Every structure is written in structure tokens, then in C-alpha cells.
Design a binder for this molecule. Structure first.
Ligand code: ADP
Ligand code: A6W
Ligand code: CL
Ligand code: CL
Ligand code: CL
Ligand code: MG
Ligand code: MG
Length: 265
């Protein structure tokens, strides 16, 4: 159906481990979108074709205003192209580097939008497993949108793929290679809430080995400026035991969230 000849390519939007993402316009309709380019050699070398099909299958069937749309795909001799919704305001990662820290209103609003999107995903027993600032995009009205579903699966699950980069957003059960479920996304939600308010993730360290130690032992402390309500929510989400992490509705109706969020459940 679709081919490369159907698009005019624009400026690079960003780069990932496998993905090179470009702004693009469909020639006949003038529709502006994002084109995620992956190299097949690369894909075969790492043996992650199953991850890419899951990304296409899962994300194309999800429909939610806080989740990035995937319209379709095509491939040629050397590359695979994912046709994505274009997010014009960029990543949360870039916004964080710009402002150093977010205030409580901005943070609570982002968390509400995240929890809404995750609640939708978990209703289909879909777990994202890779929630972090680089994978959170921003729409034209500044609304948060979850993207990059390459690591998503159906719960329950194990891990048959090698962990690539940072451990900073993964729960103990995940880094220890144990079986896991939906509660992994709630651990990540706690890590994000901390990083939004403080400017860095709670278990950050100089080495892989040291980061692993802090996560498994849940070693983190708060700066003085972090308020009581924020500390309560974060402490509840960062529990070593997955079953003691709250449900997403508990997050959405948490007193600190309701008092500071500008968006509803
Ligand atoms: N739809 C989009 N709109 C704008 N920028 C995007 C979009 N998709 C990806 N990007 C940019 O490209 C980067 C990599 O995209 P991603 O799909 O996460 O690649 P990978 O799966 O290799 O991590 C993102 O961090 C983001 O900066
Ligand atoms: C060497 O080829 C590959 O790795 C791949 S991955 C892929 C697809 C992934 C998701 C939808 S289609 C097609 C080919 N041909
Ligand atoms: Cl498995
Ligand atoms: Cl896996
Ligand atoms: Cl819930
Ligand atoms: Mg990514
Ligand atoms: Mg990916």
C-alpha cells in the first residue's frame, strides 16, 4: 500500500537505539506525520523482530487521547517504516532539561494524564514496561502522550530479551529477571513523579552495578523542598512488593493529585 515515494521527508525529530524519526508529509493529502525508520540488518542482528510486530500490533489497536497513534507501516529492501502521529511540542525529556524542575501543578497534571492512559492500557492487560521522559511526547495543546511500545507485552510475563541501557525506571522484579505484571508501570510512575519534582530519578548512580543495588534495596531520599503530599504518593508507588503498590484509581484520587492537577480523571 504505502511506499517511500508517497512521502516528502523533512527534518530529523529524534534518534533512538533502532529508530531514526523524521518529519514527513504525505504527497497527495499534504498530511503531516512522523516517520520512524528502522534498519533491517540492525533488527535482525539484535533479533528484535518480535518486539517490532508487538509495537505495531499493540499501538495500532489502542485508541486514547493520551496515547500516540500508529497509522500503519511499510518496508523495502533495507528498512522498516512506522507511520506515526506527529507530536509538535516534543518530548518531556527536553522540557525537563529546559526547566530543570517542574512545579507541583505541572507534575500532578502530567501524572494524571499518564495514569489515565495506563488505566486504559491495563484494561486490556497491556503493560508498557518502558515509561521514561524520552518516550513521553507532547501534543499541540501540551497534553502528554505515551509512545514507543517496543517493550510492551501482555501480562503476566517474563523477560526473554537483554536489557539494553539504563536501569533507572525499572522495578526490582524486572531487573532481577523474575516474572512480573501490571504493577511494573506503577513503579515507573513513582520514579517519574520524583524526577519531575527533583530533576533526577531517585536511584541514579555512577555505575550500572551501583544503580542495581539502590533499586533492589529501594534506597532513596527526598530533598527538603518536596512537600508532604508528594512524599506520600511517591512512597506508596515505590514499594518493593508489587502487590502493595496502589491501583491507578488510588493515584487519580490521591489528595495531592486532586489538589494540584488541572485535568480530571
Ligand atoms: N511522533 C513523534 N513526534 C515527534 N517526535 C518523535 C515522535 N516519535 C519519536 N520522536 C522522537 O524520536 C525519538 C525516538 O523515538 P522512539 O520511537 O522512542 O525510538 P526508540 O524506539 O528507538 O527509542 C524520541 O525520543 C522522540 O524524541
Ligand atoms: C529482516 O527483516 C526484518 O527484520 C523485518 S521486521 C518486519 C516487520 C516488523 C513489524 C511489521 S513488519 C519486516 C521485516 N522484513
Ligand atoms: Cl514470557
Ligand atoms: Cl521480553
Ligand atoms: Cl485502577
Ligand atoms: Mg524510545
Ligand atoms: Mg523501541
Amino acid at each position: 500500500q504505502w511506499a517511500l515515494e508517497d512521502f516528502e521527508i523533512g527534518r530529523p525529530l529524534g534518534k533512538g537505539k533502532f529508530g531514526n524519526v523524521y518529519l514527513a508529509r504525505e504527497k497527495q493529502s499534504k498530511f503531516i506525520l512522523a516517520l520512524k525508520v528502522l534498519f533491517k540488518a540492525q533488527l535482525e542482528k539484535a533479533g528484535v523482530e518480535h518486539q517490532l510486530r508487538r509495537e505495531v500490533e499493540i499501538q495500532s489497536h489502542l485508541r486514547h487521547p493520551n496515547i500516540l497513534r500508529l497509522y500503519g507501516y511499510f518496508h523495502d529492501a533495507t528498512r522498516v517504516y512506522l507511520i506515526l502521529e506527529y507530536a509538535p511540542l516534543g518530548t518531556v525529556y527536553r522540557e525537563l532539561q529546559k526547566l530543570s524542575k517542574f512545579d507541583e501543578q505541572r507534575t500532578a497534571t502530567y501524572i494524571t494524564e499518564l495514569a489515565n492512559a495506563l488505566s486504559y492500557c491495563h484494561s486490556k492487560r497491556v503493560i508498557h514496561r518502558d515509561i521514561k521522559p524520552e518516550n513521553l511526547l507532547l501534543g499541540s495543546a501540551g497534553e502528554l502522550k505515551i509512545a514507543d511500545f517496543g517493550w510492551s507485552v501482555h501480562a503476566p510475563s517474563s523477560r526473554r530479551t537483554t536489557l539494553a541501557g539504563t536501569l533507572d525506571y525499572l522495578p526490582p522484579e524486572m531487573i532481577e529477571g523474575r516474572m512480573h505484571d501490571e504493577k511494573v508501570d506503577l513503579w515507573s510512575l513513582g520514579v517519574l513523579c520524583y524526577e519531575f519534582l527533583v530533576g533526577k530519578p531517585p536511584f541514579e548512580a555512577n555505575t550500572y552495578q551501583e544503580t542495581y543495588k539502590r533499586i533492589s534495596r529501594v534506597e532513596f531520599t527526598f530533598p527538603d523542598f518536596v512537600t508532604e503530599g508528594a512524599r506520600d504518593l511517591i512512597s506508596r508507588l515505590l514499594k518493593h512488593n508489587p502487590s502493595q503498590r496502589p491501583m491507578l484509581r488510588e493515584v487519580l484520587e490521591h489528595p495531592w493529585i486532586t489538589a494540584n492537577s488541572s485535568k480530571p480523571s
